[PDB]
Design a protein around this ligand. Sequence first.
Ligand code: ATP
Ligand code: ATP
Ligand code: ATP
Ligand code: ATP
Ligand code: ATP
Ligand code: ATP
Ligand code: MG
Ligand code: MG
Ligand code: MG
Ligand code: MG
Ligand code: MG
Ligand code: MG
Lengths: 484, 484, 484
Amino acid sequence: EHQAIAKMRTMIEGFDDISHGGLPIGRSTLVSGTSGTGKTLFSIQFLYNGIIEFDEPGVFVTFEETPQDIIKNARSFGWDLAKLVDEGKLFILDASPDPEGQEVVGGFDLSALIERINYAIQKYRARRVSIDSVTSVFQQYDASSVVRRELFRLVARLKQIGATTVMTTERIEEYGPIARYGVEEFVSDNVVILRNVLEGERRRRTLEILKLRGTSHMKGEYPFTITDHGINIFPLGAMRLTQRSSNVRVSSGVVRLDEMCGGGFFKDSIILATGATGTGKTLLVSRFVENACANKERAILFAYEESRAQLLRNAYSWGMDFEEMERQNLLKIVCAYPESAGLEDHLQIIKSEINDFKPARIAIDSLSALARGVSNNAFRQFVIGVTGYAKQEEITGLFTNTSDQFMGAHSITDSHIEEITDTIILLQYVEIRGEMSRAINVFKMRGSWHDKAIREFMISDKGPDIKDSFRNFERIISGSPTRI
Amino acid sequence: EHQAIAKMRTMIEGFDDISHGGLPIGRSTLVSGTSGTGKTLFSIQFLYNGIIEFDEPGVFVTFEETPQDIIKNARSFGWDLAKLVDEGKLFILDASPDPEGQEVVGGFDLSALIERINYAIQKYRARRVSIDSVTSVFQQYDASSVVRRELFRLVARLKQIGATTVMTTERIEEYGPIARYGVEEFVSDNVVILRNVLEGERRRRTLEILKLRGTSHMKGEYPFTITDHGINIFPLGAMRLTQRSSNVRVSSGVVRLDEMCGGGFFKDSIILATGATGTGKTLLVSRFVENACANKERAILFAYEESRAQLLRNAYSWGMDFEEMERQNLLKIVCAYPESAGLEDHLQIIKSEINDFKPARIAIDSLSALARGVSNNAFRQFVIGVTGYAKQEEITGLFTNTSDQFMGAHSITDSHIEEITDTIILLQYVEIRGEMSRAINVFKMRGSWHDKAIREFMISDKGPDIKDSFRNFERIISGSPTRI
Amino acid sequence: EHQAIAKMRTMIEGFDDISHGGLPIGRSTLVSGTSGTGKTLFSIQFLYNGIIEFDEPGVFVTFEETPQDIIKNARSFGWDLAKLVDEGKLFILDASPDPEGQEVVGGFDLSALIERINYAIQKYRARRVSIDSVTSVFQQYDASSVVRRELFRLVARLKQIGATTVMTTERIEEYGPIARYGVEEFVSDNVVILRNVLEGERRRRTLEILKLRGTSHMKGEYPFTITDHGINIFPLGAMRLTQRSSNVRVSSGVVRLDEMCGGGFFKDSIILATGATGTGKTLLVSRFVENACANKERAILFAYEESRAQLLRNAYSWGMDFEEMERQNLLKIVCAYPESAGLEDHLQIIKSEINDFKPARIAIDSLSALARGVSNNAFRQFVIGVTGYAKQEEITGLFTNTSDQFMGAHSITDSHIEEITDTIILLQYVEIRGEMSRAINVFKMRGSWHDKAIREFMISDKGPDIKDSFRNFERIISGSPTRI
Ligand SMILES: Nc1ncnc2c1ncn2[C@@H]1O[C@H](COP(=O)(O)OP(=O)(O)OP(=O)(O)O)[C@@H](O)[C@H]1O
Ligand SMILES: Nc1ncnc2c1ncn2[C@@H]1O[C@H](COP(=O)(O)OP(=O)(O)OP(=O)(O)O)[C@@H](O)[C@H]1O
Ligand SMILES: Nc1ncnc2c1ncn2[C@@H]1O[C@H](COP(=O)(O)OP(=O)(O)OP(=O)(O)O)[C@@H](O)[C@H]1O
Ligand SMILES: Nc1ncnc2c1ncn2[C@@H]1O[C@H](COP(=O)(O)OP(=O)(O)OP(=O)(O)O)[C@@H](O)[C@H]1O
Ligand SMILES: Nc1ncnc2c1ncn2[C@@H]1O[C@H](COP(=O)(O)OP(=O)(O)OP(=O)(O)O)[C@@H](O)[C@H]1O
Ligand SMILES: Nc1ncnc2c1ncn2[C@@H]1O[C@H](COP(=O)(O)OP(=O)(O)OP(=O)(O)O)[C@@H](O)[C@H]1O
Ligand SMILES: [Mg+2]
Ligand SMILES: [Mg+2]
Ligand SMILES: [Mg+2]
Ligand SMILES: [Mg+2]
Ligand SMILES: [Mg+2]
Ligand SMILES: [Mg+2]
């Protein structure tokens, strides 16, 4: 209701939305995690993005890594730090110990380490101080309830100087105490916790802001992924899209399905195709993708069960010839497996492919095939992220979800994601005269009349040939027609 | 049965109902919690609300935060503390250690700290002493079973002075021991525990009063929220409402549904609409909201599965034109997501919107969409709180709950919240001649005759056109009619 | 098989049945618990009830609380201890330490504490010694396996003097070791453990006697409640009732239901009404309660999902006018919530209301509404307690249990409490011609013929008008009749 504290931007994607603007100006920030979770990378990215964008110099204090190894590690990410060192914009301070030395004094070097930082700030005019692996000096020969005074005097001095500070501390566990001694949380005004929790022989990185004194933030754990461009925090917000399309509709690919949907799906929506296995869902996906060749539009395909060669053979058995659209740069196939990578990296891969190719239609084959190992909440998060990222860029997406109970059941989606989609097409098996025929049904719509009827369809050598109706039977969806 | 001890009001909303009047007068109170849970904010709010309301001065003792940082943090909440310091109403005593000093004596400073506090009490005529972060002096260089005497002499001399005291202690765990040494619970006469427990990658703040010597309170854990106005504890009590409305009823929006319900729902009730997905629940919500434009009444809409445009386009496809009601200040759309914030914060958001807009009808779309990740007890608490806040302010509320098992099932609500609502409307699918039609049914009412029949309806380009009946069929609810 | 040891009564209500007569005479008793569970209150009540009833003087030993604070705390319960101190019947000895003193000797003061107790016993002729917070002297500066000798010499000396002793020890956990050092259990001949275990954000107090050397007791945990009159333990025993009523019956309220049950329920029984929601259970409860106005009898009503004014509005919509019975002191309404207090306290509230009002009929609306959060064993204990306490005072009780599966189901009660009740009335939904009609059925009886038939009824503007039968249908209970 009144004025708030000032805070400066770290320019990391996703993090500036979690903390409502960035780290506070003047205070410190504790970034604590297990080994191999991204504590050092956070500090280096926080320095580099501030140097490049706002021309704000910063220093980097080291305690167990030599500067040239840090530059060598950072070179693989793309950014060059030696050039910025030569330009006088970045200064890696070296406090790593000589392997040959003396140990006559335990930890009474902080009073000189402060001055070693302070003069360097006064010659480089730095703004972002970033002490890394600070838990190697104040705890080298000290026990508990002694490091409290050292951390207090350090944070108080960096507040007296008036620069943004980021610290780094190690952990022993994943869900236990936040730091090694359980006392560093009550000193730093900002606590950020990185986790690398392992469940079901799969790793998953998460970020959490525990406490921000004086301001507000997001409470809970938010996943991230260490890609080739650094930390990529995935946010949760879809207030950007303020547009809809009641105007001209894109074609489905089957003229009968367009007639049954009223003239096209929509320009942007989420189409869900469901049913049992062997019913014809991949045919619907292939007809949805191949239609982009008619209007010279770009559409790509995600495969999670098949593999390229088999997809081309099945397409040529239907008369599709995907090599022509592949050669015309109107088609791309990813052809990955659900267990090759974790579920969180699949969203980043899809986002990267969508950004690079810039397509108009996305078809994710077998959305339930990558929903087996993971729990319900992670799959719901993945589905919500995919649907939001497709909806905010006016892309017509079609998904596919096979069911376990093959003959007449209920609960159309076992993962309960039918409420996010816009259109639902119901495929099923209909036992007619002991020959196991199949039928189609437009279950629901979000803006047109959608032809409330049940249509028998077959699979010919060209495509889906939809027949008239089941008008002289009873209880069709239960897999047991009784003619009357 | 006899006279009780006196107690004074902290003027924090929610807390004065839990403790039956406030903290006791003369004794102390221990507020222990994990880092980042609201221990300091409780003390500052307890001082400020007592200064503003009853003109009672108070002191604030600090041990690890400088006074100007505390004033800067408190400025973001709206209240100014520097002005009250200049007015002589508040005194922040400073006992934080100088970073450059001496450590010849561990913690033998309480005999001077009592005099330092008492001299300020005698010069400011304070009533509310509030020692914060007390677990940094008596335990700075002391082991277990030694801090017992220090806390005992602290509480004894603060009771000899005779003022209300609030203490602050840290924790290491969430469900383990109450304090850091497991001994401070047996000294303080009042123990309040703050928790920040994490489950399902979501945080949830709770408050609990463990023991009040001499009086009664509420036993258990009660949730709270740190909003922009401080700690806002949600209580549990609905004895305020002593009014009912057997008189004039508000219209539903559909004249056929009003005829089927007997002339309107009621002035105040809880309407529940249920069924499977794609059945027409959002149409019922839209017709319930749009009817407020006829009588120049204010009504708002909560959306948890759509987003503005998706709602405006669907409304214009039915002939509603929500932009006119938005411009005439008779409609507001929230358009949030269930996973954006936790379930605990949604109740506060709804309460704030209801208080600010002052509407007459509330429509919460998809009450089951925010009941997925959370457990049953939390969702029941949320539903009970929403219904109580709607009922105590004579507001006609309509909710929406989709079911998982889409065809013929039982157990109308999977979360078993059917005993809180007042009206239940049953929407379902009816497989007729293999065209999959839909039907309506007023399942129950709480004061009218409500037309016990099953009516087929369709969705036209204007609204719901309800047809006559299913009089020549059988077992309609089971999703498989057999005509006779 | 032979003579047993003598034991004297503590006159605590509930405790004298668990321990088969009270604490043994001459020995000691250890009462150990967590902070805030009722250890001190047990000692004070044990002294007070022995002073008032048998005129037996007793002493109270303090180690961390001053006597005037103890008197101030005990004054809130109703009893005054200052007058008893002035009468020379009670002596609170003060051994609390001066905040200003010396610590040259750790804990070698027990040899003087023995004489200080012994002189007081010889000056007041006391019988009940009660040492409170004894775990502050022998463990103040002592380690493990050292307090064994101190506790041994203390218990041996109090046995040599020959007086009943009650001790108090603290805990750290809830289900771990019994005492702080795990050694005090093997010294005291009697061990009583108090627990304050927390589950589902709800507290629940239990009492357990671990060991009584030489005699017998009850094994397990027994719940208790700290009310305004002290500790009030609920026991488990129903050997008091030796009466039954095959004679004159009380009316149900509906003359058709009395004819269908054979002329009235009984003078004392347990009536259960079940079915789905919206079926007419509250109407049956209201007709059962309102009938007491005809014979000038007193009956009360418990509501757990209504709101007083709503009950009056629904009653006036049926033609009942509860305000006349409220003004004539023949009606009382509680109007509470199931989540306002725990299930443990609801039995105490019902017992207090029954004792104060002295009614003839009890009607607890929605017995399943307060059976959601709790487990099955706690709800079974609550039902058994309510039914036993209603049966032992010849009170005709009627209950209400809604089912989750609304359509044709089985297992009439999901909590399996159908075997406790005496009569069961089956309410259900019967789909007739697609209009969803309702029907009644007296499922079982315990002493009359009860008219084995299924009767359709409706709800008119006056009351339940029961129609003839379903004699031309089949499979009525399964919710889908087929006429033949
Ligand atoms: N080019 C890269 N692409 C993808 N992941 C990378 C790349 N370079 C490094 N990583 C990953 O980043 C992590 C390295 O993090 P970083 O070295 O910055 O800190 P840390 O290992 O968590 O800290 P500490 O040095 O204290 O153990 C590892 O998980 C590593 O696999
Ligand atoms: N040339 C063909 N002639 C006849 N039927 C064919 C031909 N090619 C494929 N089919 C039919 O296609 C079906 C195989 O399933 P399809 O590849 O269409 O995928 P889907 O069932 O939609 O899903 P998924 O691939 O995930 O199982 C079978 O019913 C098979 O008979
Ligand atoms: N304006 C605000 N709006 C919302 N939440 C806020 C605001 N200001 C602070 N908070 C929250 O309040 C908490 C800060 O609590 P406070 O600093 O009073 O004590 P604490 O952090 O629990 O104690 P300690 O300093 O001992 O760790 C954090 O969770 C922070 O996110
Ligand atoms: N212009 C239209 N013409 C015909 N039918 C329409 C039109 N707009 C919407 N519908 C129908 O509305 C239904 C979509 O559901 P609706 O938006 O009414 O919400 P709901 O089923 O009550 O709930 P939810 O949005 O949670 O799924 C479909 O049956 C669809 O055919
Ligand atoms: N008048 C009262 N009505 C209801 N409950 C009360 C009343 N007075 C006290 N209590 C409750 O009784 C308990 C106090 O117990 P008591 O002070 O006798 O011992 P204790 O707190 O368990 O022991 P210790 O002081 O060693 O921690 C608390 O739970 C308090 O809420
Ligand atoms: N004035 C009235 N006219 C017609 N029917 C009424 C009237 N008042 C109530 N009803 C009927 O009463 C039923 C509502 O349930 P009722 O209040 O009788 O409680 P219940 O079903 O026994 O249980 P509960 O209240 O626990 O759900 C509906 O069937 C409704 O039609
Ligand atoms: Mg590192
Ligand atoms: Mg496939
Ligand atoms: Mg604090
Ligand atoms: Mg909807
Ligand atoms: Mg006590
Ligand atoms: Mg009822």
